[PDB]
């Protein structure tokens, strides 16, 4: 497990999307786009395409110490997201968890059934039609 923790932690270093993540209190958002973790522009934070999957890292101060950083890592699955997108969001959520030393607590969020913890991140939560096309090649 210590060797498994080392191998997984090393692999997490090869994802540019995690560089700078979890540095300060706030909400950071990425979208899965044809298997790639793409940061969502701040002006779009809180808006989620029904056809897509996302990763939302909430960094906050825990009740046990106001000068420390704690992490809730949610991945959000749109009602019309494709399997490649949801599966990549799931795996990359574990990867970001590894990248941050296992500290984050993982939450699976689906459109319309989101936890209150997730809903409390936005004053502000708008579902948009459409989404980026799947990364899958369809086998005829």
């Amino acid at each position: 497990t210590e060797l498994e923790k080392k191998v997984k932690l090393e692999a997490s270093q090869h994802e540019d999307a995690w560089k700078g993540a979890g540095k300060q209190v706030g909400v950071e958002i990425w979208r899965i786009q044809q298997f790639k973790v793409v940061p969502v522009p701040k002006k779009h934070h809180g808006s989620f395409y029904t056809g897509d999957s996302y990763i939302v890292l909430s960094t906050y101060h825990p009740k046990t110490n106001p000068d420390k950083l704690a992490y809730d890592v949610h991945f959000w699955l749109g009602a019309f997201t494709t399997q490649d997108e949801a599966g990549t969001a799931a795996y990359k959520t574990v990867e970001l968890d590894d990248y941050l030393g296992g500290l984050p607590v993982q939450y699976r969020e689906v459109q319309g059934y989101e936890s209150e913890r997730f809903l409390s991140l936005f004053p502000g939560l708008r579902i948009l039609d459409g989404g980026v096309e799947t990364g899958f090649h369809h086998v005829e």
């Binding site: 060797l3 498994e4 191998v7 997984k8 090393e10 692999a11 997490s12 090869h14 994802e15 298997f35 999957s53 699955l77 399997q83 490649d84 949801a86 599966g87 990549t88 969001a89 799931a90 795996y91 990359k92 959520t93 574990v94 990867e95 968890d97 993982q106 699976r108 799947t134 990364g135 899958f136 090649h137 369809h138 086998v139």
Partner: protein, 359 residues
């Protein structure tokens, strides 16, 4: 540089390319020898060859025949040069270390793959479902497993294995079909039974109620046309066959049914994570394809769990290929491939390098 995804099971090979949404090659994991041929052409030459299964209950046991399976997969089916493709393979839970190392050696020394990885089948299935936490029920043609997984990490001490799966149900359906007077004996007739099983069987919500209904009325009966034109009629055999999964005694097996192994697996995990597992039972494998099996599993797990426990059985429509699809997704990720054994690394470390790279 497309990556190959090969999912080897006791009955079926599932092979294709990372990034595809389905395996391009699906063929029987069967090898015939002249008194070599693989898959369908082995079965066409049944009259002159002897056929064998190189994988038993999800474990490779005939390596010479497995080598034939992989060579057929690369050269005859996918028609790829294996030296040009990083290759992801799958293994049963708790696969012994010696089997992993010889899989590694064959891939690098015989097939000269540039990179290789062997992954946990149930973990691929869970990612394929969009989950990092859950308990996978994987039932194929040879073996059935329960594998609970938390935040991406399998819990090996809670894993359950049940040596009862699709081939046993095919044989059982063949047996009970004799009651009405039918006789399926030849392997050609046995494959017809497997087809009857996959098309007309279903899991009863209440088994004793349905038995009484099949004796009361003929409304549960279905007809089936054989290739030679003969039309047979089936009744309570439709649900008696998959009932064995919940009642292994139907074939003389002294074993808990798949509902109890699921519950038993959950109870072996820490208390604080059981509620997440109860709400995320993910079914995978062809033998979980019976209509009604999810609602039946929901009923049985409910009767075993505390009354307030929220329980959820997830049954993805394409769960016959969820293992493969999870492999196709993960192999499409550069950080996952970053962990794969390279040919260079194997040339200096040998087959023991799987214990340090493949989790």
């Amino acid at each position: 540089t497309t990556a190959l995804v090969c999912d080897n099971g006791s009955g079926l090979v599932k092979a294709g390319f990372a990034g595809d949404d389905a395996p391009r090659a699906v063929f029987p994991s069967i090898v015939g020898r002249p008194r070599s041929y693989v898959g369908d052409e082995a079965q066409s030459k049944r009259g002159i060859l002897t056929l064998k299964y190189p994988i038993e209950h999800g474990i490779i046991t005939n390596w010479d025949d497995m080598e034939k399976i992989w060579h057929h997969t690369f050269y005859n089916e996918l028609r790829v040069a294996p030296e040009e493709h990083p290759t992801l393979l799958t293994e049963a839970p708790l696969n012994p270390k010696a089997n992993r190392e010889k899989m590694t050696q064959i891939m690098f020394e015989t097939f000269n793959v540039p990179a290789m990885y062997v992954a946990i089948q149930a973990v691929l299935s869970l990612y394929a479902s969009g989950r990092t936490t859950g308990i996978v029920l994987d039932s194929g043609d040879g073996v059935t497993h329960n594998v609970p997984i938390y935040e991406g990490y399998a819990l090996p001490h809670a894993i359950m294995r049940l040596d009862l799966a699709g081939r046993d149900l095919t044989d059982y359906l063949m047996k009970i079909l004799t009651e009405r007077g039918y006789s399926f004996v030849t392997t050609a007739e046995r494959e017809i039974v497997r087809d009857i099983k996959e098309k007309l069987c279903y899991v009863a919500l209440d088994f004793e109620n349905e038995m009484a209904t099949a004796a009361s009325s003929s409304s549960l009966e279905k007809s089936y046309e054989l290739p030679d034109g003969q039309v047979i009629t089936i009744g309570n055999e439709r649900f008696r066959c998959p009932e064995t999964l919940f009642q292994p005694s139907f074939i003389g097996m002294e074993s808990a049914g798949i509902h109890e192994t699921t519950y038993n697996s959950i109870m072996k995990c820490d208390i604080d994570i059981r509620k997440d597992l109860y709400a995320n039972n993910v079914m995978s494998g062809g033998t979980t394809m019976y209509p009604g099996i999810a609602d039946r599993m929901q009923k049985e797990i409910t009767a075993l769990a505390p009354s307030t426990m929220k329980i959820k059985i997830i049954a993805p429509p394409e769960r016959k290929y969820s293992v493969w699809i999870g492999g196709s997704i993960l192999a499409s990720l550069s950080t996952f491939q970053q962990m794969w054994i390279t040919k260079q690394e194997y040339d200096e470390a040998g087959p023991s390098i799987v214990h340090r790279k493949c989790f």
